[PDB]
Design a protein around this ligand. Sequence first.
Ligand SMILES: *[C@@H]1O[C@H](CO)[C@@H](O)[C@H](O)[C@H]1NC(C)=O
Ligand SMILES: *[C@@H]1O[C@H](CO)[C@@H](O)[C@H](O)[C@H]1NC(C)=O
Ligand SMILES: *[C@@H]1O[C@H](CO)[C@@H](O)[C@H](O)[C@H]1NC(C)=O
Length: 426
Amino acid sequence: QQVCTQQAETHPPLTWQKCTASGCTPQQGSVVLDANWRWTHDTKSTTNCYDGNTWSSTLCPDDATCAKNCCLDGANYSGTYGVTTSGDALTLQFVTASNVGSRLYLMANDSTYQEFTLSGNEFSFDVDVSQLPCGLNGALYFVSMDADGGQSKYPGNAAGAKYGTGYCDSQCPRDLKFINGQANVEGWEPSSNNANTGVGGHGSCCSEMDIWEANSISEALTPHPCETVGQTMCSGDSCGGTYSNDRYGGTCDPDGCDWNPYRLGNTSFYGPGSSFALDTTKKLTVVTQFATDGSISRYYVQNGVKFQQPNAQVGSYSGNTINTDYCAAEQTAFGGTSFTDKGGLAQINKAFQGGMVLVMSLWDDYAVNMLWLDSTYPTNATASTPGAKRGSCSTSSGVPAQVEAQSPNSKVIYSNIRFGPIGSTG
Ligand SMILES: *[C@@H]1O[C@H](CO)[C@@H](O)[C@H](O)[C@H]1NC(C)=O
Ligand SMILES: *[C@@H]1O[C@H](CO)[C@@H](O)[C@H](O)[C@H]1NC(C)=O
Ligand SMILES: *[C@@H]1O[C@H](CO)[C@@H](O)[C@H](O)[C@H]1NC(C)=O
């Protein structure tokens, strides 16, 4: 895609800190809105290239031509998208006029995503999930995106990281309007249940490490490997993921090895009220540590009290870290083989050894209503089935139109981001 400037693009500033054994020092960062949320229009006029959930036939006869003829424009972060920053804090509002949610990337500077090497390091952040009811997800996570949004590889992308291009994740999402410097107009099918989205002929795959998939009821920590570590484009049903006719037939693991303390049987650890170890009516600190061999450890802080990840017993596995032993036991007990089929912990560890981009987002779920996170799932399970229950939300909760109507002023606040070697951020 090209660049237009009907609206100036100014990335909201965001400070975070880089830490060593000696201490932490503040870094001047900034955030950028994902290209999919932007206005895409004619490079020569205000005619839309994409409106509602259909593309312009004239500007966008094919994927390459569309990217030459169409630009992304700037974002009114607060006014249009409900995105604001103050110092070290990022606030994302859910519904702002016609807009729902957002997805933001941490930038090193105006042209380049910040790239984090997770291996041997830890990431810490504070979060307020108090205003995230059933059906919402304030997700903070890492993906193996190209630092320049793909410009160096794809000349049809004139916009780059400055306009939030180049997204990929382990779902191999086909809802993206631009991938690899081409549009996704070819094969585009509008969504039956969302006036603003669709599914195209291509998707965009890469490794994903979900630090934080969460609301006030449930939270999950979930690596997802891909057969190719970095970003790759897929075609149609070969993408796998949710919007295909073969979820597991692609090159990524769309399921992940998830650690959700509720799912694992501790249903009084994280939740809304003072009886929970972590009271989600109040902000908390979340610390996630990546050993050099891919073992993931976790602890939390609230009111200055440190809580280790609760120990879980899953088959023969007992412990509180994600590793191949846990992930194999989880598969055995709960079902599925996707995580190991796609390379498992060794394969996601390759992503930890490379650069990954920090993503901060707020969304509802137009596929399955967030039930995978906070209710009983899949629908052909019951509460007895091992691992079926992932939170206390109703199985009728989380319908997007319902939560957008009932809870528009839901919000998440991410703050006090810290990164450095294991042991350094506290
Ligand atoms: C942008 O940040 C990247 C990543 O740290 C860095 O390599 C590069 O020098 C920066 N470019 C400019 C023009 O500041
Ligand atoms: C839930 O986790 C908390 C904190 O580790 C602990 O106080 C409590 O005993 C756990 N409950 C069970 C049943 O494991
Ligand atoms: C359970 O439902 C899933 C879809 O979530 C389906 O793929 C699977 O075949 C179903 N299991 C049974 C036993 O019908």
